[PDB]
Short mmCIF file of C-alpha atoms and ligand atoms in Angstrom, two decimals:
data_model
loop_
_atom_site.label_atom_id
_atom_site.label_comp_id
_atom_site.label_asym_id
_atom_site.label_seq_id
_atom_site.Cartn_x
_atom_site.Cartn_y
_atom_site.Cartn_z
CA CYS A 3 -155.71 -150.96 -77.71
CA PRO A 4 -154.38 -148.12 -75.54
CA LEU A 5 -151.21 -147.53 -77.60
CA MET A 6 -150.80 -147.81 -81.37
CA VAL A 7 -147.98 -146.74 -83.70
CA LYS A 8 -148.33 -145.74 -87.36
CA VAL A 9 -145.37 -145.12 -89.68
CA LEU A 10 -145.45 -143.60 -93.18
CA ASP A 11 -142.77 -143.21 -95.86
CA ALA A 12 -142.48 -139.69 -97.37
CA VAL A 13 -140.25 -140.80 -100.28
CA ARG A 14 -142.65 -143.41 -101.61
CA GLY A 15 -145.99 -142.06 -100.39
CA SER A 16 -146.91 -145.29 -98.68
CA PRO A 17 -147.11 -147.04 -95.31
CA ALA A 18 -143.70 -147.99 -93.95
CA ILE A 19 -144.00 -151.78 -93.77
CA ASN A 20 -141.94 -154.16 -91.63
CA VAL A 21 -140.45 -151.38 -89.50
CA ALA A 22 -139.20 -152.79 -86.21
CA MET A 23 -139.69 -150.91 -82.98
CA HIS A 24 -139.23 -151.36 -79.25
CA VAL A 25 -141.13 -149.66 -76.42
CA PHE A 26 -139.43 -149.05 -73.08
CA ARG A 27 -140.71 -147.83 -69.73
CA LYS A 28 -138.52 -145.72 -67.47
CA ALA A 29 -137.44 -147.43 -64.24
CA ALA A 30 -136.95 -145.84 -60.83
CA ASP A 31 -133.17 -146.14 -61.35
CA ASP A 32 -133.58 -144.06 -64.56
CA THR A 33 -132.87 -147.01 -66.88
CA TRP A 34 -135.02 -148.11 -69.82
CA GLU A 35 -136.81 -151.41 -69.20
CA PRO A 36 -138.09 -153.24 -72.31
CA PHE A 37 -141.89 -153.19 -72.37
CA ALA A 38 -143.14 -154.27 -75.82
CA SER A 39 -142.03 -154.52 -79.43
CA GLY A 40 -143.12 -155.53 -82.90
CA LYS A 41 -142.95 -154.68 -86.59
CA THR A 42 -145.38 -152.56 -88.58
CA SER A 43 -147.98 -154.25 -90.77
CA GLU A 44 -148.70 -153.73 -94.46
CA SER A 45 -150.77 -150.73 -93.34
CA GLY A 46 -147.76 -149.35 -91.49
CA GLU A 47 -149.48 -149.91 -88.15
CA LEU A 48 -148.43 -151.78 -85.01
CA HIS A 49 -151.28 -152.74 -82.66
CA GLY A 50 -151.48 -154.97 -79.59
CA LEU A 51 -148.38 -153.59 -77.88
CA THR A 52 -149.95 -153.46 -74.42
CA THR A 53 -153.21 -153.66 -72.49
CA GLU A 54 -155.07 -151.09 -70.42
CA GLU A 55 -154.18 -152.83 -67.14
CA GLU A 56 -150.45 -152.86 -67.99
CA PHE A 57 -150.18 -149.36 -69.52
CA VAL A 58 -149.86 -147.40 -66.28
CA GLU A 59 -148.74 -143.78 -65.83
CA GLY A 60 -145.05 -143.24 -66.39
CA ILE A 61 -142.51 -142.25 -69.03
CA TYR A 62 -142.29 -144.37 -72.17
CA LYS A 63 -139.88 -144.45 -75.09
CA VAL A 64 -140.67 -145.81 -78.56
CA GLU A 65 -137.48 -146.54 -80.54
CA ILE A 66 -138.25 -146.96 -84.25
CA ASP A 67 -135.50 -148.69 -86.28
CA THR A 68 -135.62 -146.29 -89.20
CA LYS A 69 -132.01 -146.99 -90.19
CA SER A 70 -132.72 -150.63 -91.08
CA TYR A 71 -135.81 -149.56 -93.03
CA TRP A 72 -133.88 -147.17 -95.29
CA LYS A 73 -130.99 -149.60 -95.70
CA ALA A 74 -133.39 -152.26 -96.98
CA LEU A 75 -134.55 -149.75 -99.61
CA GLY A 76 -130.98 -148.93 -100.62
CA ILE A 77 -131.15 -145.37 -99.26
CA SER A 78 -128.54 -143.78 -96.99
CA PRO A 79 -130.28 -142.33 -93.89
CA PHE A 80 -129.20 -139.72 -91.35
CA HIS A 81 -130.72 -141.02 -88.10
CA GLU A 82 -129.75 -144.17 -86.21
CA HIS A 83 -133.40 -144.49 -85.13
CA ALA A 84 -136.41 -142.33 -84.38
CA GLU A 85 -137.13 -141.98 -80.65
CA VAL A 86 -140.41 -140.76 -79.17
CA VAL A 87 -140.35 -140.13 -75.40
CA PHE A 88 -143.56 -139.17 -73.62
CA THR A 89 -145.46 -139.24 -70.33
CA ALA A 90 -148.63 -141.31 -70.16
CA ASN A 91 -151.17 -139.66 -67.85
CA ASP A 92 -154.58 -140.62 -66.48
CA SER A 93 -156.87 -137.76 -67.50
CA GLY A 94 -160.04 -139.70 -68.23
CA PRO A 95 -160.15 -142.56 -70.75
CA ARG A 96 -157.32 -142.03 -73.24
CA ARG A 97 -155.97 -143.99 -76.22
CA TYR A 98 -152.63 -142.94 -77.75
CA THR A 99 -151.56 -143.14 -81.38
CA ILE A 100 -147.93 -142.29 -82.07
CA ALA A 101 -147.45 -141.42 -85.72
CA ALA A 102 -144.12 -140.95 -87.49
CA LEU A 103 -143.46 -139.74 -91.04
CA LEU A 104 -140.06 -140.80 -92.36
CA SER A 105 -137.66 -139.20 -94.86
CA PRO A 106 -133.94 -140.11 -95.17
CA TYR A 107 -132.74 -136.89 -93.45
CA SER A 108 -135.88 -135.90 -91.58
CA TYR A 109 -138.77 -137.22 -89.56
CA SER A 110 -141.91 -135.83 -87.98
CA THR A 111 -143.89 -137.34 -85.14
CA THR A 112 -147.23 -136.44 -83.63
CA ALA A 113 -149.49 -137.89 -80.99
CA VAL A 114 -153.23 -138.35 -81.39
CA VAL A 115 -154.72 -138.69 -77.91
CA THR A 116 -158.43 -139.58 -77.99
CA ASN A 117 -161.11 -140.82 -75.60
CA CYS B 8 -118.78 -124.64 -86.37
CA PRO B 9 -119.25 -128.36 -87.05
CA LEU B 10 -122.48 -128.84 -85.04
CA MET B 11 -125.26 -126.24 -84.84
CA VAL B 12 -128.87 -126.61 -83.65
CA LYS B 13 -131.83 -124.41 -84.61
CA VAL B 14 -135.27 -124.61 -82.95
CA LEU B 15 -138.51 -122.92 -84.05
CA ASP B 16 -141.92 -122.61 -82.36
CA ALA B 17 -144.84 -123.49 -84.65
CA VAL B 18 -147.49 -122.01 -82.31
CA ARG B 19 -145.97 -118.53 -82.19
CA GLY B 20 -144.15 -118.41 -85.54
CA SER B 21 -140.93 -117.44 -83.84
CA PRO B 22 -137.54 -118.87 -82.89
CA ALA B 23 -137.73 -121.04 -79.78
CA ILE B 24 -135.59 -119.09 -77.30
CA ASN B 25 -133.83 -120.42 -74.18
CA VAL B 26 -134.34 -124.09 -75.12
CA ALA B 27 -131.86 -126.24 -73.25
CA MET B 28 -130.18 -129.21 -74.86
CA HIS B 29 -127.58 -131.82 -74.03
CA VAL B 30 -125.35 -133.67 -76.49
CA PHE B 31 -124.02 -137.16 -75.70
CA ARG B 32 -121.59 -139.46 -77.48
CA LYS B 33 -121.71 -143.23 -77.33
CA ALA B 34 -118.65 -144.61 -75.54
CA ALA B 35 -116.82 -147.84 -76.36
CA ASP B 36 -118.65 -149.63 -73.52
CA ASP B 37 -121.94 -148.61 -75.23
CA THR B 38 -123.03 -146.00 -72.64
CA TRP B 39 -123.95 -142.38 -73.38
CA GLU B 40 -121.27 -139.97 -72.24
CA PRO B 41 -121.85 -136.22 -71.81
CA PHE B 42 -120.34 -134.32 -74.74
CA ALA B 43 -121.66 -130.72 -74.80
CA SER B 44 -124.64 -128.63 -73.74
CA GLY B 45 -126.15 -125.18 -74.03
CA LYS B 46 -129.32 -123.27 -74.77
CA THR B 47 -130.71 -121.51 -77.81
CA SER B 48 -130.21 -117.79 -78.34
CA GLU B 49 -132.81 -115.14 -79.22
CA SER B 50 -132.50 -116.36 -82.82
CA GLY B 51 -133.33 -119.95 -81.81
CA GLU B 52 -129.79 -121.09 -82.60
CA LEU B 53 -127.12 -122.80 -80.50
CA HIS B 54 -123.57 -122.40 -81.83
CA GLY B 55 -120.18 -123.34 -80.42
CA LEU B 56 -121.05 -126.75 -78.96
CA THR B 57 -117.80 -128.33 -80.17
CA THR B 58 -114.73 -127.97 -82.39
CA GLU B 59 -113.57 -129.86 -85.45
CA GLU B 60 -110.79 -131.54 -83.42
CA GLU B 61 -113.09 -132.72 -80.61
CA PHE B 62 -115.97 -133.80 -82.89
CA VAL B 63 -114.60 -137.20 -83.89
CA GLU B 64 -116.40 -140.11 -85.59
CA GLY B 65 -119.06 -141.57 -83.36
CA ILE B 66 -122.73 -141.90 -82.58
CA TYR B 67 -124.16 -138.70 -81.11
CA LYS B 68 -127.48 -137.94 -79.44
CA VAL B 69 -128.93 -134.43 -79.17
CA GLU B 70 -131.57 -134.27 -76.41
CA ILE B 71 -133.69 -131.12 -76.75
CA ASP B 72 -135.60 -130.23 -73.57
CA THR B 73 -138.89 -129.36 -75.19
CA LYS B 74 -141.03 -130.12 -72.12
CA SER B 75 -139.47 -127.31 -70.05
CA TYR B 76 -139.85 -124.92 -73.00
CA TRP B 77 -143.60 -125.55 -73.32
CA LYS B 78 -144.23 -125.55 -69.56
CA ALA B 79 -142.88 -121.98 -69.25
CA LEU B 80 -145.40 -120.92 -71.92
CA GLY B 81 -148.25 -122.48 -69.92
CA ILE B 82 -148.61 -125.52 -72.19
CA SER B 83 -148.58 -129.15 -71.04
CA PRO B 84 -146.93 -130.88 -74.02
CA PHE B 85 -146.91 -134.52 -75.05
CA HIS B 86 -143.19 -135.25 -75.38
CA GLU B 87 -140.58 -135.31 -72.63
CA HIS B 88 -137.89 -134.14 -75.05
CA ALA B 89 -136.93 -134.43 -78.69
CA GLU B 90 -134.08 -136.87 -79.36
CA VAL B 91 -131.91 -136.85 -82.49
CA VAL B 92 -129.46 -139.79 -82.79
CA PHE B 93 -127.01 -140.02 -85.68
CA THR B 94 -123.58 -141.24 -86.75
CA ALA B 95 -121.29 -138.28 -87.44
CA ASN B 96 -118.09 -137.96 -89.50
CA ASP B 97 -118.04 -141.58 -90.72
CA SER B 98 -116.74 -140.46 -94.16
CA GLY B 99 -114.52 -137.68 -92.84
CA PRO B 100 -115.41 -134.36 -91.25
CA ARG B 101 -118.79 -132.80 -92.01
CA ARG B 102 -120.71 -129.79 -90.70
CA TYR B 103 -124.14 -130.63 -89.25
CA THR B 104 -127.15 -128.42 -88.64
CA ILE B 105 -129.90 -130.09 -86.63
CA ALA B 106 -133.21 -128.26 -86.93
CA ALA B 107 -136.36 -128.90 -84.86
CA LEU B 108 -139.87 -127.43 -85.27
CA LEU B 109 -141.93 -127.69 -82.09
CA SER B 110 -145.67 -127.92 -81.43
CA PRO B 111 -147.23 -129.13 -78.17
CA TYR B 112 -148.17 -132.57 -79.54
CA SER B 113 -145.77 -132.80 -82.46
CA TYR B 114 -142.30 -132.06 -83.68
CA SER B 115 -140.27 -132.40 -86.83
CA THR B 116 -136.53 -132.63 -87.14
CA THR B 117 -134.25 -132.46 -90.13
CA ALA B 118 -130.54 -132.32 -90.73
CA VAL B 119 -128.43 -130.36 -93.20
CA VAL B 120 -125.04 -131.96 -93.77
CA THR B 121 -122.37 -130.06 -95.68
CA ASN B 122 -118.82 -130.93 -96.69
CA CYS C 9 -135.56 -107.83 -96.36
CA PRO C 10 -139.25 -108.14 -95.49
CA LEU C 11 -139.93 -111.44 -97.31
CA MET C 12 -137.42 -114.32 -97.49
CA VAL C 13 -137.96 -117.96 -98.49
CA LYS C 14 -135.80 -120.95 -97.49
CA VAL C 15 -136.19 -124.45 -98.96
CA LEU C 16 -134.55 -127.69 -97.79
CA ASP C 17 -134.42 -131.18 -99.32
CA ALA C 18 -135.27 -133.96 -96.85
CA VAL C 19 -133.99 -136.77 -99.13
CA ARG C 20 -130.48 -135.37 -99.49
CA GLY C 21 -130.14 -133.39 -96.24
CA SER C 22 -129.16 -130.29 -98.14
CA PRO C 23 -130.53 -126.91 -99.18
CA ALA C 24 -132.85 -127.18 -102.18
CA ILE C 25 -130.96 -125.22 -104.85
CA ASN C 26 -132.40 -123.57 -107.99
CA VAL C 27 -136.02 -123.91 -106.84
CA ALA C 28 -138.19 -121.45 -108.73
CA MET C 29 -141.02 -119.61 -107.06
CA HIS C 30 -143.59 -116.96 -107.90
CA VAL C 31 -145.25 -114.56 -105.47
CA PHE C 32 -148.73 -113.16 -106.15
CA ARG C 33 -150.87 -110.57 -104.39
CA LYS C 34 -154.64 -110.58 -104.35
CA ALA C 35 -156.02 -107.56 -106.23
CA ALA C 36 -159.14 -105.59 -105.34
CA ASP C 37 -161.13 -107.49 -108.00
CA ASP C 38 -160.12 -110.73 -106.18
CA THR C 39 -157.68 -112.03 -108.83
CA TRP C 40 -154.05 -113.02 -108.22
CA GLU C 41 -151.63 -110.49 -109.61
CA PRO C 42 -147.92 -111.21 -110.18
CA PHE C 43 -145.84 -109.62 -107.43
CA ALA C 44 -142.28 -111.05 -107.47
CA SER C 45 -140.33 -114.14 -108.49
CA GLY C 46 -136.92 -115.76 -108.29
CA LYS C 47 -135.07 -118.95 -107.48
CA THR C 48 -133.21 -120.25 -104.46
CA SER C 49 -129.45 -119.84 -104.14
CA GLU C 50 -126.84 -122.48 -103.26
CA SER C 51 -127.88 -121.96 -99.63
CA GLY C 52 -131.53 -122.72 -100.42
CA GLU C 53 -132.53 -119.11 -99.75
CA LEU C 54 -134.26 -116.49 -101.89
CA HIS C 55 -133.69 -112.90 -100.77
CA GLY C 56 -134.59 -109.55 -102.30
CA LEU C 57 -138.09 -110.38 -103.55
CA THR C 58 -139.51 -107.02 -102.43
CA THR C 59 -138.95 -103.86 -100.38
CA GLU C 60 -140.65 -102.49 -97.29
CA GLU C 61 -142.35 -99.77 -99.37
CA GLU C 62 -143.73 -102.15 -102.01
CA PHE C 63 -144.79 -104.89 -99.53
CA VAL C 64 -148.09 -103.36 -98.44
CA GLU C 65 -150.96 -104.98 -96.52
CA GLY C 66 -152.61 -107.69 -98.55
CA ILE C 67 -153.09 -111.39 -99.13
CA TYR C 68 -150.01 -112.99 -100.68
CA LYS C 69 -149.44 -116.41 -102.22
CA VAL C 70 -145.98 -117.99 -102.58
CA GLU C 71 -146.04 -120.76 -105.21
CA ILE C 72 -142.94 -122.96 -104.92
CA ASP C 73 -142.27 -125.04 -108.04
CA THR C 74 -141.43 -128.29 -106.30
CA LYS C 75 -142.40 -130.53 -109.23
CA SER C 76 -139.64 -129.17 -111.50
CA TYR C 77 -137.12 -129.49 -108.65
CA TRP C 78 -137.85 -133.20 -108.12
CA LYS C 79 -138.05 -134.00 -111.84
CA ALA C 80 -134.47 -132.78 -112.38
CA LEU C 81 -133.35 -135.21 -109.65
CA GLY C 82 -135.09 -138.10 -111.43
CA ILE C 83 -138.03 -138.25 -109.00
CA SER C 84 -141.70 -138.16 -109.97
CA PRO C 85 -143.24 -136.31 -107.01
CA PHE C 86 -146.82 -136.13 -105.80
CA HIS C 87 -147.42 -132.38 -105.62
CA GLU C 88 -147.54 -129.89 -108.49
CA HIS C 89 -146.17 -127.14 -106.26
CA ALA C 90 -146.25 -125.99 -102.66
CA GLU C 91 -148.57 -123.03 -102.02
CA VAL C 92 -148.33 -120.72 -99.00
CA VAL C 93 -151.17 -118.17 -98.69
CA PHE C 94 -151.19 -115.58 -95.91
CA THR C 95 -152.25 -112.06 -94.96
CA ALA C 96 -149.19 -109.84 -94.52
CA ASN C 97 -148.67 -106.56 -92.64
CA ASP C 98 -152.22 -106.33 -91.25
CA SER C 99 -150.90 -104.90 -87.94
CA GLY C 100 -148.13 -102.84 -89.50
CA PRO C 101 -144.91 -103.91 -91.20
CA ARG C 102 -143.42 -107.30 -90.35
CA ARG C 103 -140.54 -109.37 -91.71
CA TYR C 104 -141.55 -112.84 -92.94
CA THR C 105 -139.47 -115.95 -93.50
CA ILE C 106 -141.32 -118.74 -95.30
CA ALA C 107 -139.57 -122.08 -94.92
CA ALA C 108 -140.41 -125.31 -96.80
CA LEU C 109 -139.02 -128.84 -96.29
CA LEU C 110 -139.51 -131.04 -99.35
CA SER C 111 -139.88 -134.80 -99.81
CA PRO C 112 -141.29 -136.47 -102.93
CA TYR C 113 -144.69 -137.24 -101.35
CA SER C 114 -144.71 -134.69 -98.55
CA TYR C 115 -143.80 -131.19 -97.53
CA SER C 116 -143.92 -129.01 -94.47
CA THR C 117 -144.03 -125.25 -94.34
CA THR C 118 -143.64 -122.83 -91.47
CA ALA C 119 -143.36 -119.10 -91.07
CA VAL C 120 -141.22 -116.95 -88.81
CA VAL C 121 -142.69 -113.48 -88.33
CA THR C 122 -140.62 -110.79 -86.64
CA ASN C 123 -141.32 -107.17 -85.77
CA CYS D 5 -163.36 -144.25 -101.93
CA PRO D 6 -160.60 -143.12 -104.30
CA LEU D 7 -159.81 -139.88 -102.43
CA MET D 8 -159.89 -139.28 -98.67
CA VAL D 9 -158.63 -136.38 -96.53
CA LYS D 10 -157.46 -136.59 -92.91
CA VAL D 11 -156.64 -133.55 -90.77
CA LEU D 12 -154.95 -133.51 -87.36
CA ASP D 13 -154.35 -130.71 -84.83
CA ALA D 14 -150.75 -130.47 -83.51
CA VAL D 15 -151.65 -128.07 -80.66
CA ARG D 16 -154.26 -130.32 -79.09
CA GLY D 17 -153.08 -133.76 -80.21
CA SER D 18 -156.42 -134.65 -81.72
CA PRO D 19 -158.33 -134.95 -84.98
CA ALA D 20 -159.24 -131.58 -86.46
CA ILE D 21 -163.04 -131.76 -86.44
CA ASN D 22 -165.47 -129.73 -88.57
CA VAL D 23 -162.74 -128.44 -90.91
CA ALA D 24 -164.28 -127.30 -94.18
CA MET D 25 -162.57 -128.01 -97.46
CA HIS D 26 -163.19 -127.72 -101.19
CA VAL D 27 -161.69 -129.79 -103.99
CA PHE D 28 -161.20 -128.28 -107.44
CA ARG D 29 -160.19 -129.76 -110.78
CA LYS D 30 -158.12 -127.75 -113.24
CA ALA D 31 -159.96 -126.77 -116.43
CA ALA D 32 -158.52 -126.49 -119.94
CA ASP D 33 -158.68 -122.69 -119.59
CA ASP D 34 -156.46 -123.01 -116.46
CA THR D 35 -159.27 -122.09 -114.05
CA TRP D 36 -160.29 -124.06 -110.95
CA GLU D 37 -163.67 -125.78 -111.33
CA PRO D 38 -165.37 -126.84 -108.08
CA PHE D 39 -165.44 -130.63 -107.83
CA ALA D 40 -166.38 -131.68 -104.28
CA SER D 41 -166.42 -130.39 -100.72
CA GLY D 42 -167.30 -131.28 -97.15
CA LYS D 43 -166.26 -130.97 -93.53
CA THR D 44 -164.12 -133.37 -91.52
CA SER D 45 -165.78 -135.81 -89.13
CA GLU D 46 -165.10 -136.37 -85.43
CA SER D 47 -162.22 -138.59 -86.59
CA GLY D 48 -160.84 -135.71 -88.65
CA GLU D 49 -161.62 -137.57 -91.88
CA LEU D 50 -163.61 -136.61 -94.97
CA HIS D 51 -164.77 -139.53 -97.13
CA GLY D 52 -167.15 -139.81 -100.07
CA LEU D 53 -165.76 -136.84 -102.00
CA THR D 54 -165.85 -138.58 -105.38
CA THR D 55 -166.24 -141.92 -107.14
CA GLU D 56 -163.84 -143.96 -109.23
CA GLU D 57 -165.71 -143.17 -112.46
CA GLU D 58 -165.59 -139.40 -111.80
CA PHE D 59 -162.01 -139.18 -110.45
CA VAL D 60 -160.20 -139.07 -113.79
CA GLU D 61 -156.57 -138.10 -114.47
CA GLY D 62 -155.89 -134.39 -114.12
CA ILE D 63 -154.71 -131.77 -111.66
CA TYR D 64 -156.66 -131.33 -108.43
CA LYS D 65 -156.52 -128.79 -105.63
CA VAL D 66 -157.73 -129.36 -102.07
CA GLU D 67 -158.27 -126.06 -100.21
CA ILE D 68 -158.53 -126.64 -96.46
CA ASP D 69 -160.07 -123.74 -94.49
CA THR D 70 -157.54 -123.80 -91.68
CA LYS D 71 -158.08 -120.12 -90.83
CA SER D 72 -161.69 -120.67 -89.74
CA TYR D 73 -160.62 -123.70 -87.69
CA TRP D 74 -158.06 -121.74 -85.65
CA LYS D 75 -160.38 -118.75 -85.27
CA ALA D 76 -163.04 -121.01 -83.74
CA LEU D 77 -160.44 -122.13 -81.18
CA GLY D 78 -159.47 -118.54 -80.39
CA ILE D 79 -155.98 -118.88 -81.91
CA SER D 80 -154.43 -116.44 -84.37
CA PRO D 81 -153.19 -118.37 -87.45
CA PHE D 82 -150.68 -117.50 -90.16
CA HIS D 83 -152.18 -119.13 -93.27
CA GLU D 84 -155.39 -118.15 -95.05
CA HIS D 85 -155.87 -121.83 -95.94
CA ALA D 86 -153.84 -124.94 -96.64
CA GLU D 87 -153.70 -125.85 -100.34
CA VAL D 88 -152.65 -129.24 -101.72
CA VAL D 89 -152.21 -129.38 -105.51
CA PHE D 90 -151.43 -132.70 -107.17
CA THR D 91 -151.72 -134.75 -110.36
CA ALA D 92 -153.89 -137.86 -110.27
CA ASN D 93 -152.43 -140.55 -112.54
CA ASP D 94 -153.57 -143.99 -113.68
CA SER D 95 -150.72 -146.33 -112.69
CA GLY D 96 -152.73 -149.39 -111.71
CA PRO D 97 -155.45 -149.29 -109.06
CA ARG D 98 -154.72 -146.36 -106.74
CA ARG D 99 -156.49 -144.81 -103.74
CA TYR D 100 -155.26 -141.44 -102.43
CA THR D 101 -155.26 -140.19 -98.85
CA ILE D 102 -154.26 -136.55 -98.38
CA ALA D 103 -153.20 -135.93 -94.80
CA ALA D 104 -152.55 -132.53 -93.22
CA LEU D 105 -151.14 -131.75 -89.77
CA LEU D 106 -152.03 -128.26 -88.57
CA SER D 107 -150.24 -125.79 -86.27
CA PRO D 108 -151.02 -122.04 -86.10
CA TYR D 109 -147.86 -121.03 -88.03
CA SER D 110 -147.05 -124.28 -89.78
CA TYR D 111 -148.56 -127.22 -91.60
CA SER D 112 -147.34 -130.48 -93.09
CA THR D 113 -149.05 -132.54 -95.75
CA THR D 114 -148.33 -135.98 -97.13
CA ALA D 115 -149.97 -138.31 -99.59
CA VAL D 116 -150.52 -142.01 -98.98
CA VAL D 117 -151.08 -143.65 -102.36
CA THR D 118 -152.08 -147.32 -102.06
CA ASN D 119 -153.51 -150.07 -104.25
C1 LIG E 21 -135.71 -125.16 -86.46
C2 LIG E 21 -135.80 -124.82 -87.91
C3 LIG E 21 -136.68 -125.82 -88.70
O1 LIG E 21 -136.84 -127.01 -88.33
C4 LIG E 21 -137.61 -127.65 -89.17
C5 LIG E 21 -138.01 -128.92 -89.12
C6 LIG E 21 -138.84 -129.42 -90.11
C7 LIG E 21 -139.21 -128.56 -91.13
C8 LIG E 21 -138.76 -127.25 -91.14
I1 LIG E 21 -139.43 -126.10 -92.75
C9 LIG E 21 -137.96 -126.80 -90.15
C10 LIG E 21 -137.34 -125.63 -89.86
C11 LIG E 21 -137.40 -124.47 -90.54
O2 LIG E 21 -138.48 -123.98 -90.85
C12 LIG E 21 -136.21 -123.72 -90.68
C13 LIG E 21 -134.97 -124.33 -90.86
C14 LIG E 21 -133.80 -123.58 -90.92
I2 LIG E 21 -131.99 -124.66 -91.16
C15 LIG E 21 -133.91 -122.18 -90.83
O3 LIG E 21 -132.78 -121.43 -90.91
C16 LIG E 21 -135.15 -121.54 -90.66
I3 LIG E 21 -135.42 -119.40 -90.51
C17 LIG E 21 -136.28 -122.34 -90.58
C1 LIG E 22 -153.65 -135.70 -90.85
C2 LIG E 22 -152.78 -136.85 -90.42
C3 LIG E 22 -151.27 -136.53 -90.51
O1 LIG E 22 -150.81 -135.62 -91.29
C4 LIG E 22 -149.51 -135.57 -91.16
C5 LIG E 22 -148.65 -134.76 -91.80
C6 LIG E 22 -147.30 -134.83 -91.54
C7 LIG E 22 -146.88 -135.77 -90.62
C8 LIG E 22 -147.79 -136.60 -89.97
I1 LIG E 22 -146.87 -137.94 -88.61
C9 LIG E 22 -149.11 -136.50 -90.25
C10 LIG E 22 -150.25 -137.11 -89.85
C11 LIG E 22 -150.36 -138.11 -88.94
O2 LIG E 22 -149.82 -138.01 -87.84
C12 LIG E 22 -151.20 -139.20 -89.24
C13 LIG E 22 -151.40 -139.59 -90.56
C14 LIG E 22 -152.26 -140.60 -90.91
I2 LIG E 22 -152.48 -141.03 -92.95
C15 LIG E 22 -152.91 -141.29 -89.89
O3 LIG E 22 -153.74 -142.32 -90.22
C16 LIG E 22 -152.74 -140.96 -88.55
I3 LIG E 22 -153.76 -142.04 -87.03
C17 LIG E 22 -151.87 -139.90 -88.23
#
C-alpha cells in the first residue's frame, strides 16, 4: 500500500467514518484525471487506492468530501471539501500516509512519508 | 475588507512573508475563473483582494503557493499549495478571514466569519 | 505589549470570547508562581497581561481554561485546559503572541515571536 | 492498551522517534503524581503505559519532552514541552489515543476515544 488516507473528527474525538474521497493525477494538459476513490472505514482509514506499479511520480490531488460528512452529522461546515495536492517523488522506497483532522471551520493535514 | 488571508510559519515562529496566492470563483459553466491575487505583507496578511460589491455569492477557492515559499527557505516541502474552497455570502454578506499555518509536511487552515 | 494571547473557536468559526487564562512563572525554588491573568475580549484577544519591565527572562506557563469555555456552549470537551510552556526573553526582550485554536477533542497552539 | 500516545514530526513528515514522555495523575492534594513513562518507538508510538485495572477515572497529564527532540535535530524550539491534560471518564468501554503533531514553534494535539 503506497498511499493511505486517514481522517479524524475533532468534534467527536473519533475516526471520521464513511468519508468519501477522490484522488486525481495531473495530466500534461494541466487537467485532473480521476485516479482512485473510496470511503473511509470504521477506523477512518482508506487503503488499497493504488499499487506501487501504478503510483508513478507526478502531482496528485486528494479531494475529501468533508461537506457531506458534516451535513450527515447535522453540522454546518465552512469548506466545500478538503484538498491535498502534492508531488510524489522517487527517493528510495517510500509509502505515503495523508492524514486530515476535521473541524467544521478548520482542518489540518499532514503527510507521513516512510520507507 | 470582506476577504483577508493571514499566513504564519510554524518553523520560524513568524508571519509568512511574500507568500503568493490566487483566488478563483466558480463560473456558471463550472470552471474556475480568476478572481483576485496578491502576496502577503511583512505581517503575513493580504488585504484588499476584493470589495463588498464585487464579492457576490459563489464558490471561491484560495490557492496559497506554499511550495515557492518553502523553496526560497531551502526546504523541499510536501504540498504543491494549500487550497481553501468555500461557499461565500450564501446568507447575505459576510467578512471572511482565511488563516493558514505552514510547516514543510503539514498545514492547518481555519476561517473566521463575521457578520 | 510583550505578551498577547489570541484564541479561536474551530466549531463556530469565530473568536473564542470570555476564555479565562492564568500565566505563571517558574520561581527559583522550581515552583509555579502566579504572574498574570485575564480573559479574552470579543475579538478573542487578551492584551495587557504584563509590561516590558516586569516580563523578565524566565520559564512561563499560559494555562487556557478551555474546559469552562466548552461547557458554557453545552459541549463536554476532552481537555481540562490548554497549557503553553516556554522560555521567554533568553536572548533579550521579545514580543510574544500565543495563539490557540480550539475544538472539543483537539487544539493547536503556535507562537509568533518578534524582535 | 487503554492509553496510547502517537507523535509525528511536521518538519520531516515522519514519526517522531525516541521522544520521552511522562504521565502523571492528579492527587487529592492537587499535586502531580508520576504514573507512567516511556519513549516513542520507530513508529512514533508509545504503548503499554498502563492497564485497564490501573487506569481509573481522574485527571491525567502527559508531558512530552519536545524540547529535547528538537535539540537533538539541531533545531531551536519554542516550547519547553507539550502538555496534554484531560479527564478520563467511564462511559462504556473506552480506549484513548493521544496524538501530537510537532513543529518547532507550534504543536497540535487530538484525542481519539474509541470503544
Ligand atoms: C495564519 C494564522 C493562523 O493560522 C492558523 C491555522 C490553524 C491554527 C492557528 I492557532 C492558526 C493561526 C494563528 O495562529 C493565528 C491566527 C490569526 I486570525 C492571527 O491573527 C494570529 I497573530 C495567529
Ligand atoms: C501524532 C499523530 C497526529 O497528531 C495530529 C495532530 C493534529 C493533526 C493531525 I492530521 C495529527 C496527527 C496525524 O497526522 C495522525 C494521527 C493519527 I491518531 C494517525 O494514526 C496518523 I498515521 C496520523
